[PDB]
Design a protein around this ligand. Structure first.
Ligand code: ZN
Ligand code: ZN
Ligand code: ZN
Lengths: 415, 416, 418
């Protein structure tokens, strides 16, 4: 209902985001961000909607949310987050904006294209909340933040770490424009945090690796994985130090020095052959120097290949670079149906259907990528081509034409 | 004006074709329009062309709208015991148009789409149009006069009306025909009086009627519209026309059940007696192509007397050429056909198949566009023609043709 | 010596089960033996029962050994354009055994029994390999084509297949492994054309079981070059009505593989509506229903089949449906009868183990698992399971004596061979 209307608007805005904002669609980073975000939602109160967490390639710090439990986070959050609980505090803040329906209340009381044009401007390299909205979001946030097993003091520590940067810097962090931070708010955040018991929690090994991949592979402007940080991480706790070798191998591979990335990756590969993170890096090193087969053999022998979308996409791509397009199609035809919103699967499906010379299937896989990006007229154009290369009355013609109808009914709902 | 309702009639027909289950069989649409135009031939104050559509729906109903477009549910064939009763339903609808009953109903009134959605719901098997008793009184009086001038039995209208009332007088929910067309006793009584007042005329239902009934009930099987062997057993004892149609009906079901050898020898006696009959020639091609004897189907149709004049024979021979591996000959016929019958989607689809086999892709896309345009999917048709226009040289004649047709389809969109 | 060879053949198939990737799918195994036995029924001097095995291997090969056991690599469905090509290869193998070529070849030499088994396992596994003389291959072709035509297949399908093998041994650098076991010099090819030309032309249409088998093999058991490609399905969509239905089946199968259950139901719907009693469509409709947690709908459809008491495919399908439906006792009643009537079918023993596991009858589950291990030649493991099963029942009980008795049989089977 109003849940239905708001999830319909949520999808429209997510499509607009995908079409203009620079989202990181990395399988590992998308998986981590959503697995961490769901962990907070499962401990939140009054959840009416599914939740999805999006990552922008933007070195300006910002976080916001809109209808349908869609939370969008700038990758610069990893630069500011010293630990996983800090990053979780910002997400818990955003989920609390959603559970309180702060944005819904404002627009209800007193335009769809006007609000959507602001959401794209905030993500691309404005909405503002009252001081009661921010007060509600911090408390409800910190309560769901520690029921999730994170450090409650991380929220005031991150806020005060935000306030200190705003005072000295030429221009304030853009997140402080969407979420204003008077000293009154920080003092209130310190009060409720101090009211609970101290909790020193170790950040997940997945957090340190995500921050390494976010800053090393998706570097941009101030979002660099500096040699200072890694020399610093080489001296740290048990989880931080192997995250060091991972990021070191990353840019050795980024700079096309693949032989250097092999020797750095060796010990973590040999020690942990069953986790997706170095398996993923252990596919890119192999395909970069035309060693596709053992990258396939390595992924064929993986345990959680039939459980983890990251290994499936990695192995599908390896089959493509290995000259076996059909094996890639077999995986991707099932992946696209179980991961309807993952534009990586649709793109790889199109690449495989292109290599098999199945033109209408290629055009159809391309169309789903264009529909996900809000380019409905363009997706309809591709399906019309697809429908024109199969015989009328066939199973494929009825499918392509029915899909055109769906996209046309989706289009009129807002136009 | 009249130009808009003819144009609005085309709009409703297009979205009817795109979603209602219309029967596109060459013989059936040729018969029902031939019978319908014969009635228009004797109607007064006709200001529009007329077209008659057949819908696969076992619920009996009939209605008409702007542009002289009459819609008939296939169930009318099982209710009509003779040809004059079926014509009685058409003359009723025809009079609804010449009196412009629905037109004035919509003059006293998102309004076009509101009625389009209603017409579409009435047509599909699964907010409905109803006419006033005055409109229905006029539609029977003028309708029975059109029906007498056309050389049928005027008494078929009240017998039909009494047939349906005798069956639906007691039902909680009568058939949909009586909701659109309310039949109190007063309207029946007046219908029977005016029929009694003119002259008696005993007419025999044309041969074409009995085989149209057999094919409608036979090939377009669905639900209560099966042709039970009960009707075929009865027709085997009826008049000379009903016994032939009975054996044509079971030759039809033998072919439906892939009993091709049974179907040939069952159709055997009828084809020998009337070797130039379209109904028998049509069925013989179905049997021949089902046994991969395309050559035999071609030679028979090439020797057909009125192949050069009858659209049913042209389509059958064009399709046989296709199954025979001669796409060029099929295209030679279909190019002539599609320009002689611009609204026939059977012609356009077969031409698309021929042009695909010939690998003339821009001509194939152009033919495919017409099928999509006739079904109300104008954007899709415009898309195909844009592809066709992109595969011809700039400044070429073909490019000017495709671009000009896109303009016609685009202009047809902006009217609604 | 027939008694020795048929027990020696049992040892080899046990060794095949335990190491080669055999396709145990009920429909496919039933088809390949239905057609194989149809050729044996028209063969001469048959002294042995016959079983045909399907290996999930994309390299084309076929071979046969003692006890009338013929092994067929699933690649054969990729090379076979018609049912008579497939039968031509099977008749060739059936001709190898009735002439006892492998038996007569090994009487010349005399440890050795296991050296032959390692060769057989290496040929079967995808990954020292037996090859026949030119005399043997001539006999197997001459005798085979006569069996092939007595069975109502196209005799010209034998020379047409042989040349198809040669035509891609020159196109590719790869020589098909079938031609390493069964050498194909041009003398043999000319001989095959000659014997076929002496017989009368026969246009036979393939059974619709062949196209569905080809569809199920390449679509459900796809591997390497064995794929049910869109190119194949498009050509079947343009062919005769049997290929059109099989193309509809194959696409429904692949939708089911990809969890597109509602799409798969709409695709199978016209085929199952046309023949509601067809095992291939009944089988697929069950997979679709169980995929959507619709066991009751799956159970009810299979109880309405005529051949439920006669067709082993429907029996296993319904036992598994009962399993997913939370009725394991009803599954066990089917499988207790099945495993008694089909002692050598590993599917029955595995599903019975699942049913006894679901009923918390641990010793009966262990004994069922043991049969699966014994059929795969893992006799010590099967003895280990039966020993543990015997340890959960009372001494002097009827169950104790049976578990111990079967241990005795398995150990007695161990000392006959090394
Ligand atoms: Zn906020
Ligand atoms: Zn009326
Ligand atoms: Zn041989």
């Amino acid at each position: 209902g109003s849940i239905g209307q708001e999830m319909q608007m949520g999808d429209y805005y997510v499509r607009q985001l995908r079409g203009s904002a620079p989202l990181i669609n990395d399988p590992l980073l998308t998986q981590y961000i959503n697995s961490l975000g769901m962990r907070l939602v499962s401990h939140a109160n009054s959840v009416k909607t599914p939740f999805h967490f999006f990552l922008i390639n933007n070195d300006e710090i910002n976080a916001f949310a809109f209808f349908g439990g869609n939370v969008v986070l700038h990758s610069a959050l990893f630069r500011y987050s010293d630990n996983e609980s800090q990053l979780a505090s910002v997400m818990a803040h955003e989920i609390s904006h959603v559970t309180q329906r702060h944005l819904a209340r404002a627009m209800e009381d007193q335009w769809v294209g006007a609000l959507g044009s602001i959401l794209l401007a905030m993500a691309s390299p404005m909405i503002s909340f009252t001081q009661q909205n921010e007060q509600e979001a911090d408390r409800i946030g910190i309560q769901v933040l520690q029921r999730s097993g994170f450090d409650p003091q991380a929220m005031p520590t991150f806020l005060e770490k935000l306030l200190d940067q705003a005072r000295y810097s030429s221009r304030p962090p853009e997140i402080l424009l969407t979420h204003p931070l008077p000293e009154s708010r920080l003092a209130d955040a310190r009060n409720r945090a101090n009211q609970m018991r101290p909790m020193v929690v170790q950040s997940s090994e997945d957090f340190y690796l995500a921050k390494a991949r976010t800053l090393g592979m998706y570097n941009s402007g101030r979002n660099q994985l500096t040699s200072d940080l890694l020399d610093e991480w080489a001296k740290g706790n048990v989880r931080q130090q192997r995250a060091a070798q991972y990021g070191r191998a990353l840019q050795a591979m980024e700079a096309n020095k693949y032989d250097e990335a092999r020797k750095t990756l060796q010990p973590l590969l040999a020690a942990e052959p069953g986790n997706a993170w170095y398996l993923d890096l252990a596919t890119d090193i192999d395909l970069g120097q035309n060693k596709a087969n053992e990258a396939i053999n390595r992924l064929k022998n993986a345990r959680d290949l039939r459980t983890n979308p990251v290994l499936q996409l990695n192995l599908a791509n390896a089959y493509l670079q290995g000259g076996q397009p059909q094996e890639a199609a077999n995986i991707l035809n099932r992946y696209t149906f179980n991961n309807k919103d993952d534009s990586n699967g649709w793109d790889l499906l199109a690449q495989a259907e292109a290599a098999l010379n199945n033109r209408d299937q290629e055009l159809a896989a391309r169309a789903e990528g264009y529909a996900l990006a809000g380019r409905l007229d363009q997706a309809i154009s591709l399906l019309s081509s697809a429908s024109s290369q199969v015989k009328l009355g066939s199973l494929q013609q009825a499918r392509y034409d029915a899909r055109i109808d769906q996209l046309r009914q989706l289009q009129e709902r807002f136009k």
